Amino acid sequence: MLRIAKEALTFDDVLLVPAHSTVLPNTADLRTRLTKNIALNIPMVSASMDTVTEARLAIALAQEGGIGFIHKNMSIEQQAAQVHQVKISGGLRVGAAVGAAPGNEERVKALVEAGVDVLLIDSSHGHSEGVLQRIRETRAAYPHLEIIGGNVATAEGARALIEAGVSAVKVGIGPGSICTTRIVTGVGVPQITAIADAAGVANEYGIPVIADGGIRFSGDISKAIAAGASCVMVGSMFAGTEEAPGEVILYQGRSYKAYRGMPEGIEGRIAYKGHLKEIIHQQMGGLRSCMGLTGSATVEDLRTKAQFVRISGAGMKESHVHDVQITKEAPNYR
Amino acid sequence: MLRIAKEALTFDDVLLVPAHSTVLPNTADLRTRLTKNIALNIPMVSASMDTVTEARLAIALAQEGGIGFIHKNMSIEQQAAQVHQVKISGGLRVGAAVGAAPGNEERVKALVEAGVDVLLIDSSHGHSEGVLQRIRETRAAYPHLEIIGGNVATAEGARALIEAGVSAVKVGIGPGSICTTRIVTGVGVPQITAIADAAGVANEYGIPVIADGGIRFSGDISKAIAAGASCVMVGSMFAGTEEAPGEVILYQGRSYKAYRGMPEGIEGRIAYKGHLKEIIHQQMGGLRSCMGLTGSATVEDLRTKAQFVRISGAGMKESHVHDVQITKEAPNY
Amino acid sequence: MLRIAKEALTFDDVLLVPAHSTVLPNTADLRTRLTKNIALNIPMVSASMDTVTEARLAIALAQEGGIGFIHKNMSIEQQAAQVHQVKISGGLRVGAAVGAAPGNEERVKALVEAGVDVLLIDSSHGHSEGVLQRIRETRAAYPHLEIIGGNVATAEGARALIEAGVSAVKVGIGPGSICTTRIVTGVGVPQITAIADAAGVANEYGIPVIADGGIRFSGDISKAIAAGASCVMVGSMFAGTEEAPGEVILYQGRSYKAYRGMPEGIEGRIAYKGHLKEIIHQQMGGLRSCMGLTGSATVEDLRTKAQFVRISGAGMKESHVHDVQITKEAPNYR
Amino acid sequence: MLRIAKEALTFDDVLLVPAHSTVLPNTADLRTRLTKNIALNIPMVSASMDTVTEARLAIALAQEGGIGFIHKNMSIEQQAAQVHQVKISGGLRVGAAVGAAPGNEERVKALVEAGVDVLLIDSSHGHSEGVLQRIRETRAAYPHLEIIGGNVATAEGARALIEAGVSAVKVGIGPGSICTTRIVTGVGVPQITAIADAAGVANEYGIPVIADGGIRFSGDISKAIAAGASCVMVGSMFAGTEEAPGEVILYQGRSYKAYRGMPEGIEGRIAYKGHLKEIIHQQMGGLRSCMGLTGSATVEDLRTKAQFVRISGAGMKESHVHDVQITKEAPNY
Numbered sequence A, C: 001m002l003r004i005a006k007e008a009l010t011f012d013d014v015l016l017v018p019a020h021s022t023v024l025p026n027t028a029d030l031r032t033r034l035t036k037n038i039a040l041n042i043p044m045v046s047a048s049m050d051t052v053t054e055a056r057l058a059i060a061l062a063q064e065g066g067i068g069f070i071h072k073n074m075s076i077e078q079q080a081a082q083v084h085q086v087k088i089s090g091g092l093r094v095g096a097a098v099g100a101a102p103g104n105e106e107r108v109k110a111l112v113e114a115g116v117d118v119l120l121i122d123s124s125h126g127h128s129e130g131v132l133q134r135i136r137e138t139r140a141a142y143p144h145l146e147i148i149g150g151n152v153a154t155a156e157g158a159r160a161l162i163e164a165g166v167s168a169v170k171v172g173i174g175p176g177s178i179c180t181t182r183i184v185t186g187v188g189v190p191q192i193t194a195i196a197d198a199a200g201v202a203n204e205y206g207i208p209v210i211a212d213g214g215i216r217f218s219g220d221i222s223k224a225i226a227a228g229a230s231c232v233m234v235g236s237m238f239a240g241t242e243e244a245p246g247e248v249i250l251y252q253g254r255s256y257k258a259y260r261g262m263p264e265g266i267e268g269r270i271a272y273k274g275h276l277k278e279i280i281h282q283q284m285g286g287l288r289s290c291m292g293l294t295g296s297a298t299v300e301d302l303r304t305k306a307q308f309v310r311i312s313g314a315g316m317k318e319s320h321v322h323d324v325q326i327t328k329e330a331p332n333y334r
Numbered sequence B, D: 001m002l003r004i005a006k007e008a009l010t011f012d013d014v015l016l017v018p019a020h021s022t023v024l025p026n027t028a029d030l031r032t033r034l035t036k037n038i039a040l041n042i043p044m045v046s047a048s049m050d051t052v053t054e055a056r057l058a059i060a061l062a063q064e065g066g067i068g069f070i071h072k073n074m075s076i077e078q079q080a081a082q083v084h085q086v087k088i089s090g091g092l093r094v095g096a097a098v099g100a101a102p103g104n105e106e107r108v109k110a111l112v113e114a115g116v117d118v119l120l121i122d123s124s125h126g127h128s129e130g131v132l133q134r135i136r137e138t139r140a141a142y143p144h145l146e147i148i149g150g151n152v153a154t155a156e157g158a159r160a161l162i163e164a165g166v167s168a169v170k171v172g173i174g175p176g177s178i179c180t181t182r183i184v185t186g187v188g189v190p191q192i193t194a195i196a197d198a199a200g201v202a203n204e205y206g207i208p209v210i211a212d213g214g215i216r217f218s219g220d221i222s223k224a225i226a227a228g229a230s231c232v233m234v235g236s237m238f239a240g241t242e243e244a245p246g247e248v249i250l251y252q253g254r255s256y257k258a259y260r261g262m263p264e265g266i267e268g269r270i271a272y273k274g275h276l277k278e279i280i281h282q283q284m285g286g287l288r289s290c291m292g293l294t295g296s297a298t299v300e301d302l303r304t305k306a307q308f309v310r311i312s313g314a315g316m317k318e319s320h321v322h323d324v325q326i327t328k329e330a331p332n333y
């Protein structure tokens, strides 16, 4: 007998159910929490990747209300340099990622000295004991430092991270656009199910959930939040924008930037997205519209009370633009 | 736990079932009702888009048993003129759309005295309080004016419209060919499920339900009605036609005409499909072949008696043309 | 509330379950019944279409053990000519189709005089009273003439046809390769479900079921039979073969023939299939192999006792050839 | 009523679940068992196809912790030689395939005295009486010769093989890359469901189950084991390699090697993928990253403890690379 735990759903398997509303899209409140002690003005944080977030993007993102995470594919000093560099740009908040393996001891130390607002312990498997123990050791050394652990996709995995002492649980095993983990390993959980399962446990402790990977459209943000996420960590959305690392590549007619997986990942190309400020404006414009459609005055309104309906592939095809030859693609329909 | 109401279906997810029939397709009674007090000879109405419905198409559709809704992005005086043109063009019935911004009753006032019959207030969210409020005022300000409210996609949504005072409930959240609302916001319900949910409530009041969007062929029209809609509204299906606004466009051997949605949508190319009279006969022809298959004498029967079956992805490929390479295309395909 | 009757399946939704076997493929018995009083050596009959079955194909098919149906898109005399022409080729059996509308009165008369072995009353809707009454009128005039009615896809539709006096019920509303009925009307039932539902009623009366339309591979034959069909009516399989009407068309590199729908249908092109004899050999070679895999000594063994399993689109993709670039396509994998 | 046993699933229908882990990928114990009395260092064996396994690939796979099965379309004397070559090539274990025609024990006799360890009788129908009979005779004629029987895809099918006297049950009816059996006959069961059904029976006898076909990546290997297979058999994954029979082929900028099935199949092109040693490290690497995710210390745990989740079509697209355009391809992708 096959040991099937359950059925699992991702973003294209569901739609948000429209409801009675006393909220205008321009009156929606996008304020939320990144950690238990850290609040964001917009529910967006950047991925800690060499092709996504350095000091330049982290500033532009923080100016819009989010938080950038400095990747760890550089020297400690350089990483510490960028944090302070971000910190001295109008009192901006900034996170910094580290490895879960021993050796990040003084890297964390310097970042704390560099005045990092939230530490991210990064791993492919947040439910591994080696990762759990690094959180415990890190928590004791800095009793009130905000720390984010991951990644997981299960309730106990979320539960295990919480007693380790995390301030927020990051959800996502496989849904990364440049990720092949689910293919190469055969292990993974469709992101919508991943969020809700972790949301079920994190809610007990009042600990925020970060949905990480898989977001491709602005409507995906609304679904991740409605699944239980406090905010979303994205890469393919910030890959392309001017502020992100890497130069623009003109290829076979159009502009591109490099977007690679930090083999589980790949090295790819992604459409240049101009200035970050417009991207967030476009992205948060869909959420606000969604919050208007579902009567969600706040993010907590959407995160806790919004309803779903399950759809087929035929339903998703109906959701997309269909049976017409597009002549002017919208900037948000890239 | 993830809050899933239920699984929702649309056109390609289902098929209708042939029953014992005493109805020949040509004899079938296609007559139905747009609103509480407005009948139609065919269950087809046109979308209030500036690339679909103005006077000519409205007149054409009305001179075939339907009704058109003149779009609203004009001068207030232009839309009244367009309405009037249809009215003097053979005493045809006509509708027109308005919004709900800080100031719209002026346009509403001008339209009624243009001889307009049914007022449409097409919104991207029919269940919003502002729309619900703007509907109550208009009904209070115009007690005998037939009012169409929408769009909604739930059972509870249609209830509000009806209790707000609408004469008809319009259904559709993100299924339109040009629509990106579901992609941009993540919000929406598959049309057929959306149709059935609103109808189930609206039938008890005796209020007609209108299917707005998602119709690609005449088969969809049949399914939309069988799910509970008293009539359907189309955009792409009527777009591109001669009577539809815009010159013909020549593009790489193929002929087209523009089609723009009213950022919640995009602009694209739709194929040129001759005079509107020719389209309707084919679309009603397929509908007639449906009623003949179902043994449905009138629209009401198909709407209330016809049964569906749920199909799979393979079942939808078996439905379309397969194996063979199309050498001589069919008018409706 | 939406009035959904049930879920319906077609050929690609299922697979036959392999079982214990004491049968070799070359020892499988393909003998079956077309009507209650007519037995076939192979469970195949041709479609009564102008691009499929005239006198030439009907002979070649009958020589292999099947029965051809002369289409009615010709004069009565010409149609009567072809039947006799087929009849005088070694005592071959032959069917002939007619319309359900009044006016086929003497066409049937001549065909009966022409010595047709089985009459087919053809209609898009076998469950229509006008069609039912033509069977009743036809049955009385020729009390023991073998008559086939259709098309239906439901149990009562099969039941209604039976009391009308049919000798066999033909199943299939929409699955035709050149058919667009399900698209244009929105009415139809996936063929696997269509057969079984009709099989449930026809079994009560010992009346054979003819599965009509949708067969694309030899494995589809086995599924139709296992669904409850006594035999299958095919068009796209006999379209292309040398014996079928129409000449060979060389187009953009390869050979073709015309295959059109008798608007509900379309006019198309289909790959030239050489001699019919080889096609049947290839087609009946898959059935025999199937009957070996499922321990089916007879067709009744497969038709009554064979099991199914439901599969996904992922399962069907696994069933096909995958993840390799075919360099030599098999004649039966056209 | 249509006789549907149950819904059956394969690799792309499911995914594995990450559990609490005290297993680093590099520490993971990949050791398993081919048969009742034959162990393997890795759970990989090669298909007995003339475009996959002869002496060189067998030696290579055996010198990496696996075993090869020399195909049978040779002279009886050639296959014995090929077996012997592997045997003297470092005392490696080796298998070989035979049929069941009117006369095969001669080949069977020649193979055993070539030093062969496990006899394979690969059939297109393991549950046929002739195969079941030919298995009983061989076990009677060779009581201590390890016998592999198959292929089957049901629970009741594996029971017969075990009761007939096989040392291992091989599973697979139509899932192979080159296989057209399911298309030609309509008969077959999706591999993962097929794996679980045979295993559920074979585990009670303590008999190993082998997964034969359907493996495209290392992730499939993990799923096949978790469903109950003690090891997997691959054809395309090892085909094309240097040690695999055939010259390299140059075709339109890309390099290949031939791959023919043994009309139940076809012939095609598979990509060139370097020395076999390089393939296995990547395929076992992904498997190691799986066990590390699942917290599985040994193959048995993954085989008996790991849980699955059922995914949809969208869930399978989220798994693969999406959105991004691949600029630098990964070895395992």
Ligand SMILES: O=c1[nH]cnc2c1ncn2[C@@H]1O[C@H](COP(=O)(O)O)[C@@H](O)[C@H]1O
Pocket (backbone or CB within 6 Å): A047, A048, A123, A124, A172, A175, A176, A177, A178, A179, A212, A213, A214, A215, A233, A234, A235, A236, A237, A260, A261, A262, A264, A265
């Ligand atoms: O190599 C890696 N190991 C583990 N996770 C990765 C790696 N590279 C990218 N990711 C994940 O993929 C996400 C980005 O995917 P995207 O937002 O869908 O394009 C990141 O935020 C990480 O969670």
Ligand SMILES: O=c1[nH]cnc2c1ncn2[C@@H]1O[C@H](COP(=O)(O)O)[C@@H](O)[C@H]1O
Pocket (backbone or CB within 6 Å): B047, B048, B049, B151, B172, B175, B176, B177, B178, B179, B180, B181, B212, B213, B214, B215, B233, B234, B235, B236, B237, B260, B261, B262, B264, B265, B266
């Ligand atoms: O730009 C837009 N955004 C979202 N929905 C639209 C837009 N324009 C038209 N619609 C809807 O789509 C319907 C027409 O869709 P169609 O019949 O499938 O082409 C209209 O009647 C409106 O309800």
Ligand SMILES: O=c1[nH]cnc2c1ncn2[C@@H]1O[C@H](COP(=O)(O)O)[C@@H](O)[C@H]1O
Pocket (backbone or CB within 6 Å): C047, C048, C123, C124, C172, C175, C176, C177, C178, C179, C212, C213, C214, C215, C233, C234, C235, C236, C237, C260, C261, C262, C264, C265
């Ligand atoms: O125009 C028609 N009206 C009704 N059924 C048709 C028509 N043309 C073809 N068919 C059906 O389609 C079948 C052939 O489809 P095929 O075997 O799948 O290619 C025929 O045997 C008929 O049952």
Ligand SMILES: O=c1[nH]cnc2c1ncn2[C@@H]1O[C@H](COP(=O)(O)O)[C@@H](O)[C@H]1O
Pocket (backbone or CB within 6 Å): D047, D048, D049, D151, D172, D175, D176, D177, D178, D179, D180, D181, D212, D213, D214, D215, D233, D234, D235, D236, D237, D260, D261, D262, D264, D265, D266
């Ligand atoms: O030509 C054939 N017809 C049917 N099955 C085959 C044929 N050749 C190989 N197989 C099966 O397919 C397996 C290999 O499939 P693969 O690992 O997916 O490429 C073999 O071990 C056999 O079980």
Ligand SMILES: [K+]
Pocket (backbone or CB within 6 Å): A318, A319, A320, A321, A322, B174, B175, B176, B177, B178, B179, B180, B181, B182
């Ligand atoms: K849409």
Ligand SMILES: [K+]
Pocket (backbone or CB within 6 Å): B318, B319, B320, B321, B322, C174, C175, C176, C177, C178, C179, C180, C181, C182
């Ligand atoms: K069809």
Ligand SMILES: [K+]
Pocket (backbone or CB within 6 Å): C318, C319, C320, C321, C322, D174, D175, D176, D177, D178, D179, D180, D181, D182
């Ligand atoms: K296959």
Ligand SMILES: [K+]
Pocket (backbone or CB within 6 Å): A174, A175, A176, A177, A178, A179, A180, A181, A182, D318, D319, D320, D321, D322
């Ligand atoms: K992925």
